[model samples]
Target chain A: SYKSVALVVGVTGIVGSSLAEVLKLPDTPGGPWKVYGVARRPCPVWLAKKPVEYIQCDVSDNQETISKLSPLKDITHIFYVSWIGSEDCQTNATMFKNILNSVIPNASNLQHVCLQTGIKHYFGIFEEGSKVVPHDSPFTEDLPRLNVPNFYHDLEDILYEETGKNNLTWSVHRPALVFGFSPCSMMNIVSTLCVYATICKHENKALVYPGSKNSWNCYADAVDADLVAEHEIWAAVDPKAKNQVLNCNNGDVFKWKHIWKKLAEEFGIEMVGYVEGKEQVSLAELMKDKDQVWDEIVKKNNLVPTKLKEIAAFWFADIAFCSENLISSMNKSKELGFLGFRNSMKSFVSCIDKMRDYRFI
Target chain B: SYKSVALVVGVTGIVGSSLAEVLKLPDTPGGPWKVYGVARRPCPVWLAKKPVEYIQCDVSDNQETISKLSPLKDITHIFYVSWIGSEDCQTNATMFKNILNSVIPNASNLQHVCLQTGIKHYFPHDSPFTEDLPRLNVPNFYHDLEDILYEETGKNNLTWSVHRPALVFGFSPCSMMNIVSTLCVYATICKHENKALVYPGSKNSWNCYADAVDADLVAEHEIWAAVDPKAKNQVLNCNNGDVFKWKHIWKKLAEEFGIEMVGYVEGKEQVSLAELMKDKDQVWDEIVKKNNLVPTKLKEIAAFWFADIAFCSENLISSMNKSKELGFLGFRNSMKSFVSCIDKMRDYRFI
Candidate 1:
C-alpha cells in the first residue's frame, strides 16, 4: 500500500505551488507522495507541472468541486491553500467547505489537513490596521480572536467543525507576507514589486516607495513560500503538531528599507525613496493607466505576454507596504517540532530573480 | 568512556554558571561529560559544587591560566564566558590570548570553542543588526577576542562559534551585565526603603521592543554549536525570538517585588542607580542581615552602573535567524525568562 497520496488544493496559489515543488522531493518526510493539485485556474507556464497531477476545477463552485475532487480516493492529506480575495466571510467559508465536503467523504485515507491562512487572522483583513485595534505583537498563536469581518476566522470555524467529524486532524498556518514565485496568484508582494520595477525601468524613473516612511523604518517579518510549505508538511506528518494553530514566518525580523535597496539595484534603476513631507502615492491609483508602458516594456524585453493589471497587484502591495508592523511569533511552530526558516532577504531576491528568469519582469 | 569533556571559562558568571549546570545533566547532548570548571574566584555556594571540579585561577594572569589550566588534558570543548569590566581592548585581548595559549596546545583533544560576546560587537545602533556588520572604529575587545580565538583555533583541529546576546537575563549576581540580578537588588532596596520603584531608564527603553537571552538557553546554544558541525564557524545573534517592552515588564517587576511601579517620567531630573544607591550599602547589608540571606556585597551582587547603561541607552534589537537557520532551535519567552529569573532570584534569597 502507498504510504501517502496528497491533494494540494489551490495548487496555483502562492503556497500551493511551493507544496507542489516540495512534496515531490525524493527525501520528503513521507516518501514518494503522489500529489493531486487542484486549483480554479489552469497551471500557468511559470509553475512547474510537478509531480503534480493538475486538475482545473473552481473549488468555489460546489458541484464542480465535488465532481473534480471526489474521485481522488487515494488522497491521504489535504493542503488547502486556496481562498477568494474579498473577506466576505459567509461566501469564503462556503468556498472552503465545498472543497472539504468534496474530499473528506471520498478520500477515506485522508489523515490530515493543513489550511494556509494569512496574518489577517490576528490583524483584521487588508487596510484594516487602523480601522480596528488588533492584538499586540510578537503576535503569539494563543491570542483570542478579535471580532472582525475576517474570513480567516470563518474558514477556521468551518475547519474545526468539519474536521471534527472525520478521523482527520487539522492545522491552521497564519504566515506573514509570503515571499514566493507565483505569476498566476493574486496578492503577491515580490511579483508586484518587480512589476512595479519593470514599469519604472521602462521610463527610467527612480524607483520610489509607494508606502509610508514608518513602513520603511519599522520592524517586519515575512515567510518564504517554500519555508511555509515545509512547515505545513511538518505539521501534516508529525504527531506532535496535530490540531494546533501556528504563526508561520521566517523566524527573523527585517526592514523594508533593506529590501527596497535590493529592488532598486536589481531593476538597474535609481532611487527617489520615501521623502518625509511628500504625499505618499498608492501604486494601485498610480499604475491604473500604465498598461501602454507595461506592454511596450514587455514587447521590447521579449517578456511573456501579459497585461499590467494581470501581472501587478498594486492594491495588495499598497496594503502590504503600510506601517501596520505585521510581525508574527514563530514560538508555537518551533515548540511543535517544525523548525523551518528562511532568510527573508535571500527569499525576496530569489523570488525576484525567479520572475526575471521566467521573463515575467 | 565519557563522550566529551568541557572546560567552562568563568564558571561562576552568567552563562558560565549555566554551562556548568547544564554540562553536568545526565541527558545533556554531550552526555557523560567530564567537566573542568575554571573561574577567577573560589566557587560560590549558590552554584552547584559536585562534578564541577572548580579550578580557581585568573585567566588574565597568563602564568596563572597556564599553571592551573594546562593540566586539563581531556578538554574536548571550551566555553569562553569570562571578561573584565574595564574594556581596555588591549588588556582583555591579552586575557583571552592567555586562555588560548594555555589550553590550545595542552588540550590536544579539544575539537571546538564557544566564545560569548555582547551586541556591542557592532557599534551600538538603531539598526536590527545582522551577523556580518563591521566592528566599531574605536577600540573594541569582542573583535580582539574573536581574533585570538580563530587565530589560535586556526592552526588546530578546532572550529569555533561566536554568540552575541543583547541584555542577558541570567541568575548571576556577580555578572558584569546581569540585568535581572541588578533589577532584583534595586527592587529589594526600593521595598526595604518603602519607595516607588521608579523607572531609571529613558522613554525609548520603555516604548521600544527589547530582546533578551535566557542564560539556560544561551548555555544550550553554546553546547549545540560545539557539538553540531553545521553551526560551526559562524557568529550567531542569540536571543529569545520574541520582543517585549519595558512598560509591560515594569508591571511584572512591580508585581514580583511588591512595590509601586513607575513609568519613565519626562521633564524630571534624571537619576541613575549609581547616583541613587551611593549611600544604600548599609541598607542592603541590613536587609541581608534581617533575611539571614547569603552574604553579598552591594558592589559584588548588583551591577548598578551596568543597569544605568542599559536603562539610559536606546533600544537595540538582535536577530536569531542565523542560529535558527543553522539548525539550533534554542529560544525562550522573554516574558517567561524574565519572570523565571526573578522567581529563581527570590527562591535563592538574592532579592
Candidate 2:
C-alpha cells in the first residue's frame, strides 16, 4: 500500500500542474501515495479533481506554509515544484534558506523528494532577471561553484545541504522551456507564444529566433507537456534514480527547422524562419504594434510583463537539454526497476486531447 | 508505490548503518524505499534484511566505484557518506580534492546529501577536542583555508593578489613561543594543580561552552546522519557543549598517581594512536586490563586522544557545536558509533 499524502510545491505552473495530474493518478508509484498540491493561489480549479489535496503559498513563505501543513509530517514525499516570480521577493540566499527551513526539518518521513530547476543553470545568457549569470560549461555537477548571480545555485545549495541532514531520497530535474495550458497562465511560452504565432501567421511575417547562430544553432531538446509530466513521475518512484541528475527533453534534437515549425503549430501560424544578420529586431520591437495582443497575454496569463526580456531568454532552456547523452536518459533509472522514455508527438496530440476533454486548452 | 531505491556512499560505519535501517522500515513514509547501501566490503550480512540492496565500492575512486555503478543514473538521490578514516588525511589537500572529485559529478540526482564535520573547525586545541581554546578562536575552516593561503603565498605573487599580504604575515620572528611569557611554564603550572589548563580560578570551566567542528568531526560525530541544521554552514567557534580538559587528570595520574609511564607508543616514529601514546603505558595498560581488550592500539587514535584529553588542554569540538546551536552535548559517537563500528567488524570475523 502506497502512502497517500503528497505535496506539490508549484502546482499551478505549466509543468507543475501537469505534474499534479500525474501525481493524482491512481497507479503512479508514490501514488496510491496520497497527494497534496500547492501553488501561489487556491489550488487551481482544473487540478481539483485529483485525490490530491492542495495548499496555496509562495515558495518564499515555505516556513509559514510548512507550519500550516504541519500535518505534513504524514507527507512521505515532496515534489518541490514551487518557484519565485519576481526579483525583490526572490533573492537566492533567502530562497535557499527557505528551502532548508521548510523542507529539511520536515524531512522526517520523506523517503523521496523531487526538486524542479530549469535551463538557467546552463546556457548562461538571460536578459536581466531571468537568471543572475551563467557559469561555464559541459555544465557537469563538478563545475566550480560559480559566483555567477543565480538564485538556482542558492536553491540547489540549500536542497543539497538538507539532503545531507535528512536521510531522504531525492531527485532534481532540469527541464528546458515548458509550454502548455495552465490556469497559471505563462506569457512567454504558452500564452504569449500562442498569440505571437497567431499574429505572425496572420501577418505572414518572419518570426524571430533570438541569439547568435552558435547559440541558435546549438539546438533544443524540447519535451512535450505530457512527457514532462511523465518524467516527473518517473524521477520520484524509480529506485535507480537515487542520487542522479537527469535532463529532460523531446529526445529528438532539433534546430531552427523543428523549433520554428512547432512554434507555428502551437500558434496556428507560419514562420519565414531565421534571417541571418538581418539587423534582427527584438521581440519587444516586433510586439510594438501588437500592444493589445501583448496586454491580453499578460492579463490572461496573470503575467507581470515587467520582466518580458528576462522571461524571453528562458525559452531557450530546451536547447541545453539536447546536449546531454541520452535519447531519454531514463536508463540509469530503468536499472532500478522504474521505466520511462520521451513520448512521441502522437502522445502529445493525445495530451492535447486530454486538455481539450478537460477544456484546459 | 514508493520507489524502493536508495544509494548510500559510506556504508561501512555506524550512522550509515542506522540510516540504512531507517530507510527500510515499512512505516518509512516514502519507503520501504529500497535502500542500496555501499560499503568497503560486501553488504554486511546484518544489513541484508529489510529492503536493502548492497554494493561494495569506494566513493573516493573516480573510475573504480563510479564506473562499476555507471548504470545508476536511475538512482533518484544519493546519500554521499564516504571519507578517509584518518584526520591526517583531511590535512592533505590532494586527498580532499580526490574525495570531492568522486562525489561531485554523480551528485546530480542527490536530493539530500549529509557531510560529517565538526569542532576541528573552531580551535585546534590539544585538549578534550571541545571548543574553548584560551587562544583567539580560529576556526578549522579558517585555518584550513589559511593553511592553503600560506602554501600559496610562497608559490607566487598572484597569491597576494586576492588578500593583503600583511594580514597573513604573522611575525614568526617575534613568535618563538606560541604565547609570550609561557612555554613549558603553563605545563608546569598545570602539573602543580593537577588541572590541564583551567579558568584562572576567576572563571568557571563551564562558563564558556563552545565547540569547534570541521568536516571530519561531522563524519565521526555522526551529525550528518540527521543533517542537523545546527551543523549546517557552521564554522567552529567558542560556544557551548560537553567540554572538559583532563589536562590535570593526566598530569595528576603521572605525577601524584605515580603511574608508570611508558616511552612513546610508537618507538620513536609517529604512526598509529597505539604507537604514539606508547609513553602512556600505565593508562593504556590499565584500559586494556579493565576492558579485557586485546593489546592492539593504533598510534593515531591514541595521539588524537592524548592531545585531546591530556596534552592540548583546550576544547574545540564543544564550542563549534554551541556556536551553531547544533551541539549534541550528550551526543556521543565515541561510545556507540565508533564502538559498533569495531563491533560490527568483530562480528563479521574481520577482527
Interface RMSD of 2: 26.4
Docking class of 2: incorrect
| lDDT accuracy of residue B13 in candidate 2 | 51
Q: Would candidate 1 be rated incorrect, acceptable, medium or high by CAPRI criteria?
A: acceptable
Fraction of reference contacts reproduced per prediction? 0.37, 0.00
Candidate 1 displacement at residue B154 in angstroms: 3.8
Query: Please, what are the lDDT tens digits per residue for candidate 2 over residues B1-351?
Result: 545355666655533555566666555434546566766666555666646667776555656665556555445444444444445434334333343345345544433333333334434433222333443453333344334434433442211111100000001111111111121223323343354432121111111112221122333333232234444333233221112122222232233323332222212322332233346545444454554544433331222333323232222222222322343332221212223333333344222
Computed on C-alphas against the true complex, the DockQ of each candidate is 0.37, 0.01
List candidate 1 stretches off by more than 4 Å.
A42-48, A124-134, A272-279, A285-288, B1-3, B27-31, B110-113, B124-126, B155-158, B173-177, B186-200, B251-300, B312-315
Residue A350 of model 1 has an lDDT of 94
Q: What is the TM-score of chain B alone in each candidate?
A: 0.94, 0.43
Measured as a fraction from 0 to 1, the native contacts recovered by model 1 come to 0.37
Q: Could you give candidate 1's per-residue lDDT for residues A172-211 as a string of tens digits? A: 9988888987766734788889888878888878898878
